[PDB]
Amino acid sequence: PQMFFGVLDREELEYFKQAESTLQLDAFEEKFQFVTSIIEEAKGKELKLVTSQITSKLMERVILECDETQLKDIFQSFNGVFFGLSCHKYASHVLETLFVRSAALVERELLTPVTMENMFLFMLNELKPHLKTMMNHQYASHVLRLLILILSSKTLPNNKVYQTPESFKSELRDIITTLYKGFTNGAESRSDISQSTITKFREYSVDKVASPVIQLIIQVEGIFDRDRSFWRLVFNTADEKDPKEESFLEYLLSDPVGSHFLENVIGSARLKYVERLYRLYMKDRIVKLAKRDTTGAFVVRALLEHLKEKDVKQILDAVVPELSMLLNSNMDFGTAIINASNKQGGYLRDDVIAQLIQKYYPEKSDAKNILESCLLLSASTLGNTRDDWPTAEERRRSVFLEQLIDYDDKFLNITIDSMLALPEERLIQMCYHGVFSHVVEHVLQTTRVDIIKRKMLLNILSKESVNLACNVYGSHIMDKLWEFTAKLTLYKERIARALVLETEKVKNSIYGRQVWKNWKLELYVRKMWDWKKLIKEQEFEIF
């Protein structure tokens, strides 16, 4: 109804363009004087400013950089056009900024005993008629989504969470229920609603702009309204197949927005409803859903997380036998199932193990490393010439592998043998690598590994004892070798000898001096007898 408030002069435009530059410069706490000089010049033009693209961001800065009593002064200058501003491409981000600062101010008033809270309530009240429109407006829907987060003390896009006053609870309710009316054009029962409006609503859940709002509400509505009638808007209560709901489900599953709406929603549904959906519609599509990764396999994860013993068992029964084909593109389906299998007391565990070994170590091959199955090793950052750090994905991969190791002895052995299968220098390379080294050291589970493998591993690493202990990463591999070497102490001797051979290189190596302590090399050097004691100590400390 109102978003075009005139334009700026050339003189005015120049002044502010000027102003904005010197602010992002920081050539100064006289900052303030400048800032509040801008404010004085902004006096009475706030609207033109906030709507113009050139100056839109200037305002946003001033909002971020001003007195609380200037904050309010600006907030005030927006009375009676808050709705227009939110519908504006630029003004609506100014609003987003302004409302977030206000939130903190309102927490402050809340903790630090005309108030910001009341200034706020006032604005909330002029939006109220316009909610329903705000919901599917490309810009205003965000301002709306924001507000709801604010009123519910949910962390704020813009670790940023503030405590709310009581009236905020009231106001959250007034806007949840105002929407409900706008969209059910009249109370008072699921009975009274046409499936003309029900489906009108179902169609929303798949809009890119309105679906996030509907999710938010559905999650947050529980605080007051135990109905939960927004959910019931979207879904039926019990306990039979409706071809309307059913085809709506498939409509959800056959869409990115729709699938993610679904899974987020599964998260805040009460368990009654989730089981219902599963029992009714999911149960016999569960594979087709899983292999429709993605999206649609995201949902099957949500089910697993948020369901109970009988159901998850049912699911695993369906999923484990196709796990090797399900790891195709995405590993994080695998961790889902393992976590699932475990949380249920190792249900279907062996076939799970069996399925992994199928995907990553199939005994029908020359090449067999999980090191190449699981980390794309040859294709990785392992020694690039180009000074490249490990990727986030590489870390992501490593971690996966690491828990595989934890999951079963089978996997620990398989990776050891994969490391052993490698050219030795390439295993050495691993030791100096940011994430991959952690994989090496993670393999050094002295109790879980048998001696022949231990001996063989030791043999590669001993060749580089000192270079290892003076490297940021290698030192951890060397540290663990102290225990890793119990009952194999012609190798302890070997290394200790090697390290003492290079005493001055090793101490006054940041990382070296540390290994020195842990191998107790100070003893070695002075009371060699007392050393050979410790070793015998640590043997029966382990066994």
Say if 366 falls within a structural domain: yes
Residue pair 294/258 in contact by the 8 Å Cβ criterion: no
Three-state SS at 343: helix
Report the helix count and the strand count for the chain, using DSSP H and E. Answer: 35, 0
The CA-atom distances, in angstroms, between 94 and each of 75, 100, 160 are 11, 10, 18
- Sign of the Cα torsion 178, 184, 189, 190 reads negative
CATH number at residue 119: 1.25.10.10
Q: Which two tokens stand for residue 138?
A: 């490309």
Domain shared by 2 and 139, yes or no: yes
Query: Looking up tokens 């190449």, which residue turns up?
Result: 372
Domain shared by 260 and 396, yes or no: no
Q: How many CA within 13 A on the CB side of residue 386?
A: 6
Query: Looking up tokens 């889902």, which residue turns up?
Result: 336
d(CA 234, CA 265): 11
Say if 165 falls within a structural domain: no
Domain shared by 394 and 247, yes or no: no
d(CA 376, CA 380): 6
**Per this entry, what is the length of the chain?**
543
The CA-atom distances, in angstroms, between 509 and each of 118, 475, 494, 512, 520 are 62, 11, 20, 5, 16
The CA-atom distances, in angstroms, between 373 and each of 81, 287, 359, 398, 423 are 59, 24, 8, 12, 17
Say if 390 falls within a structural domain: yes
d(CA 394, CA 374): 10
d(CA 82, CA 74): 12
DSSP annotation of 186: S
Domain shared by 153 and 290, yes or no: no
Last-in-domain residue among 240, 274, 307: 307
Say if 256 falls within a structural domain: yes
Domain shared by 262 and 320, yes or no: no
Domain shared by 155 and 11, yes or no: yes
Q: Which of 169, 294, 156 is nearest to 222 (CA)?
A: 169
**E-assigned strand segments in 339-411:** none
d(CA 515, CA 476): 8
Domain shared by 197 and 323, yes or no: no
Cβ density class 330-364: b for 16+ within 10 Å, e for less: ebebbbbbbebbeebeebbbeebbebbbebbbeee
Domain shared by 5 and 120, yes or no: yes
Last-in-domain residue among 421, 443, 465: 443
Last-in-domain residue among 409, 443, 477: 443
- Per-residue HEC secondary structure of 81-115 comes to CHHHHHCCCCHHHHHHHHHHHHHHHHHHHHHCCCC
Count of the separate structural domains present in the chain: 5
Say if 76 falls within a structural domain: yes
Q: Which amino acid does the sequence have at 10?
A: R
Domain shared by 147 and 282, yes or no: no
Say if 171 falls within a structural domain: no
Instruction: Tell me the residue range of the domain where 63 lies.
Output: 1-159
Give start and end residues of each alpha helix (H) in 236-331: 243-253, 256-268, 271-277, 286-290, 297-305, 309-319, 323-326
Say if 488 falls within a structural domain: yes
Residue pair 139/93 in contact by the 8 Å Cβ criterion: no
Domain shared by 51 and 146, yes or no: yes
Domain shared by 380 and 492, yes or no: no
Q: Which two tokens stand for residue 12?
A: 């005015």
Say if 173 falls within a structural domain: no
Domain shared by 298 and 405, yes or no: no
- Sign of the Cα torsion 424, 428, 431, 434 reads negative
**Experimental method reported for this structure:** X-ray
Q: How would DSSP label each residue in 443-498?
A: H--TTTS-HHHHHHHHHHHHTTHHHHHTSTTHHHHHHHTTTTTTT-HHHHHHHHHH
- Give the resolution value in Å: 3.1
- Between the two ends of the chain, the Cα-to-Cα distance in Å is 80
